[PDB]
């Protein structure tokens, strides 16, 4: 719970590693990724959070309004595949 500059370098490194290799495993499983609307962020309205809930660091969170995102059964299965792949990579790292 510290600004990412003072936050541990290895901590943020494995954070962005989880995200990066996570999306890479998505595209490796067979994901088809396409651009639809970059202005969707401005179209959707951010939910209103109190000042205390806002972080003291100063960086501005952008929690998007999860109502319109719908998970198809194919997306649920691909979620399951991604979770299984994450379990496999963590288990392999521990085994080595």
Curated annotation (Swiss-Prot):
Disease annotated for this entry: Ventricular tachycardia, catecholaminergic polymorphic, 1, with or without atrial dysfunction and/or dilated cardiomyopathy: An arrhythmogenic disorder characterized by stress-induced, bidirectional ventricular tachycardia that may degenerate into cardiac arrest and cause sudden death. Patients present with recurrent syncope, seizures, or sudden death after physical activity or emotional stress. CPVT1 inheritance is autosomal dominant. Ventricular arrhythmias due to cardiac ryanodine receptor calcium release deficiency syndrome: An autosomal dominant arrhythmogenic disorder characterized by syncope, cardiac arrest and/or sudden unexpected death, often in association with physical exertion or acute emotional stress. Patients who survive manifest polymorphic ventricular tachycardia and ventricular fibrillation. Unlike typical catecholaminergic ventricular tachycardia, arrhythmias are not reproducible on exercise stress testing or adrenaline challenge.
Tissue: Detected in heart muscle (at protein level). Heart muscle, brain (cerebellum and hippocampus) and placenta.
Physiological role: Cytosolic calcium-activated calcium channel that mediates the release of Ca(2+) from the sarcoplasmic reticulum into the cytosol and thereby plays a key role in triggering cardiac muscle contraction. Aberrant channel activation can lead to cardiac arrhythmia. In cardiac myocytes, calcium release is triggered by increased Ca(2+) cytosolic levels due to activation of the L-type calcium channel CACNA1C. The calcium channel activity is modulated by formation of heterotetramers with RYR3. Required for cellular calcium ion homeostasis. Required for embryonic heart development.
Parent-protein start and end of this portion: 918 to 1013 of 4967
Free-text comment on this protein's domains from its UniProt entry: The calcium release channel activity resides in the C-terminal region while the remaining part of the protein resides in the cytoplasm.
Family affiliation: Belongs to the ryanodine receptor (TC 1.A.3.1) family. RYR2 subfamily.
Induction: By TGFB1.
Domain of life: Eukaryota
Subcellular location per the Swiss-Prot or TrEMBL entry: Sarcoplasmic reticulum membrane
Signal peptide from the UniProt entry: none
Lineage: Eukaryota, Metazoa, Chordata, Craniata, Vertebrata
Quaternary structure (record): Homotetramer. Can also form heterotetramers with RYR1 and RYR3. Interacts with FKBP1A and FKBP1B; these interactions may stabilize the channel in its closed state and prevent Ca(2+) leaks. Interacts with CALM and S100A1; these interactions regulate channel activity. Identified in a complex composed of RYR2, FKBP1B, PKA catalytic subunit, PRKAR2A, AKAP6, and the protein phosphatases PP2A and PP1. Interacts directly with FKBP1B, PKA, PP1 and PP2A. Interacts with SELENON. In cardiac muscles, identified in a complex, composed of FSD2, CMYA5 and RYR2.
The protein's name: Ryanodine receptor 2
Post-translation changes: Channel activity is modulated by phosphorylation. Phosphorylation is increased in failing heart, leading to calcium leaks and increased cytoplasmic Ca(2+) levels.
């Amino acid at each position: 719970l510290v600004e990412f500059s003072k936050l541990p370098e290895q901590e943020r490194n494995y954070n962005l590693q989880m995200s990066l290799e996570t999306l890479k495993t998505l595209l490796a499983l067979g994901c088809h990724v396409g651009i639809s609307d970059e202005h969707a962020e401005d179209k959707v309205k951010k939910m209103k959070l109190p000042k205390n809930y806002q972080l003291t660091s100063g960086y501005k969170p952008a929690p998007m309004d999860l109502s319109f995102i719908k998970l198809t059964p194919s997306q649920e299965a691909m979620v399951d595949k991604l979770a299984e792949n994450a379990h496999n990579v963590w288990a392999r790292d521990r085994i080595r």
